[PDB]
Amino acid sequence: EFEFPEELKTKLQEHINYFPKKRQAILLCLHEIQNYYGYIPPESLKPLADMLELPLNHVEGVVAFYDMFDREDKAKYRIRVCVSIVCHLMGTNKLLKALENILGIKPGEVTPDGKFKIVPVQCLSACSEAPVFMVNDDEYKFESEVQLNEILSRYT
Amino acid sequence: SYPAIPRIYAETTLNMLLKRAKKPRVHSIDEYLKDGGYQALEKALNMSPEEIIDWVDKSTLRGRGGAGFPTGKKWKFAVQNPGPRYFICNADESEPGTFKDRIIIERDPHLLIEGIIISSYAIGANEAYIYIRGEYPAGYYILRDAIEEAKKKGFLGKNILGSGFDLEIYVARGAGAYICGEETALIESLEGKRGHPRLKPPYPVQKGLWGKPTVVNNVETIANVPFIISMGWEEYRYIGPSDYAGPKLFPVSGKVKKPGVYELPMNTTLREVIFKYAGGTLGNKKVKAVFSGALDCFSSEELDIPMDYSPLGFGGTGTVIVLTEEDDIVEAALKIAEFYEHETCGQCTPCRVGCYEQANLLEKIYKGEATEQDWEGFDFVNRNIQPTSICGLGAVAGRLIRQTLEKFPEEWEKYR
Ligand SMILES: Cc1cc2nc3c(=O)[nH]c(=O)nc-3n(C[C@H](O)[C@H](O)[C@H](O)COP(=O)(O)O)c2cc1C
Ligand code: SF4
Ligand code: FES
Ligand code: NA
């Protein structure tokens, strides 16, 4: 019953044909699926496994292992907040408090409209610009609530 | 158009690896060529692979990924074994406080691509990979575009510049695991599996990707290869101390006035990095400790050490996280424990349970909820993450924390 929309299927086939061996494309495909849906739909794993010519068990294991993949919550924008040593020292808690005042959600939560999800992550390796956060692929230094609010207003 | 990247401050006294990357923007192939870019590759293709290995060896270049293995020697080990051989650029950079590699990838991708081509030619690899962490999406799109620019100017593809040497560079993405920076786990991930380190020996140089001889080198290591060929090994060896020669990137963060990446010789001291280059501390507060990534902890009495790979030197990757007098060391140690808890792959039992328990018990200690048994258990677990471990993570998960216990006992005793 589950079918990948042609525009996604095409992008997926491109990754599968990119490396010398099909199975090497598993992570590029999973990033593509998550960017398309806003999560990894459990039903997408069987068609992907078939395309990669891998058992479903292998794909499920890979999805479970890699922390960037989320099989439970659909979110238009993922706010990855660094909770490691440098950002902690420089203001992770100020960033989280600002996010709560603006969006009304805490780490691991998704807004009622399914628009934003706060994801706590390890070191994003932009430590000199602590406290760091990402909004999907975009990465920023948190300065203040006023600055953060303006950044978030760009994601509609 | 690429995703937003924070503008990391970058400064150099050597004008080599940061010649262009001191400017926070993408330097495309035309600007790169205008600086004499790809001319070291042209010179390399006119030399034998054996000669390139000899120059890289004589340069004294050592791995910038943390283990410091001599690069030229690593190449000799791989070419001892029959082909096909594979070349891998390790762009997984995920250790807390480490942001040196990304500024090369994002601002001077061609310096890295040129290094990859020369290195691949040296080891006879016709297929190379860049494995870049999933949290570097901009770095990924910049490298894909730069690789295509190199293809169009004939630096990649078949019979590169009429040399008869073929090379394709594939860009692979990680997806959230620090362990995927471990060279055998990186290879497992590149093979389309979970990033689980392999039992060593065999080492990748003998049996790596698809069981074939594989050379894995860090971004910063590779970025030196064009300078070694352009300058020649002798001129390169003149930079900095003769025993730890060449430029080195220092990612500096925490309570400094000017956090960012510094390109400096390796005879620079830790105190010079902090005060002479990074502008001293925020609010001129006393330095309490320096965390060498998630690996070591140096006290305020240890700042006169050189930034080299000597035993008394700073070591690691040159990662400098500055903590001042107001920063709680126990609260800081908890953040390190939490890192290892989140990153153990779980294959080894003392690593799997030790990384979990060190963080769980340390949180109890921090929150004032630890019993005497939790305190004794914490000390035991911290000293016992390493047994039976098959990779470097288990061996170091308790290292920095043990050092805070030894160097800051007054602070820990306050939590008792
Ligand atoms: C847990 C763990 C994580 C590592 N992460 C990285 C990393 O992100 N980048 C890197 O180049 N090396 C990393 N390494 C080291 C590599 O295994 C390897 O030593 C290195 O990539 C070899 O290149 P080099 O000789 O140029 O330093 C890591 C090692 C371990 C044990
Ligand atoms: S030491 Fe830890 S991280 Fe390394 S293979 Fe064993 S369980 Fe995994
Ligand atoms: S500690 Fe937050 S980006 Fe490194
Ligand atoms: Na990774």
Numbering used by the authors:
A (entry chain A): 5 to 160
B (entry chain B): 3 to 418
Reproduce text from the manuscript describing this model.
We therefore sought to lock the peptide bond in place by exchanging a nearby residue, G129E, with serine and aspartate, respectively. The longer side chains were intended to occupy the position of the bound water molecule that has to make way for the flipping peptide bond according to our structures. Structures of the oxidized G129SE and G129DE variants were refined to 2.4 and 1.9 Å resolution, respectively. Overall, there were no significant changes from the original NuoEF, with the notable exception of the peptide bond of E95F that pointed away from FMN in the oxidized state of both variants, as was the case only in the reduced structures of the original protein. No electron density for ordered water was observed between position 129E and the fixed peptide bond in the variant as determined with NuoEF. The 3.5 Å distance between Oγ of S129E and the carbonyl oxygen of E95F is longer than the 3.2 Å from the carboxylate oxygen of D129E to this position. Thus, while both mutations fixed the position of the peptide bond, the Gly/Asp exchange seemed to exert a much stronger effect than the Gly/Ser mutation.
